[PDB]
Design a protein around this ligand. Sequence first.
Ligand code: FES
Length: 98
Amino acid sequence: PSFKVTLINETEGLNTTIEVPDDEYILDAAEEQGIDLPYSCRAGACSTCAGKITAGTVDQSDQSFLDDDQIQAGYVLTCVAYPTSDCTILTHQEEDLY
Ligand code: FES
């Protein structure tokens, strides 16, 4: 099973919905389909790949940087996030965490 993940960053000209297997991280699946997303550690330990969820849900249990307030506010570490429903994610949201 796969989910439709809408990735959005209009300064990049990015507004694209891709099919992501339920066992693949969003960053990896995006890259495979030719999308460029920001990243550094790829380990869920920083905020470089941070995005913000505006629709749908993810499993990011592997992440270890975002606190509970930040998770509640919709933030996601795309390098370690599986989609769990069709979802919409604003990418390059690191500065919004400041
Ligand atoms: S690139 Fe460091 S948490 Fe995703």
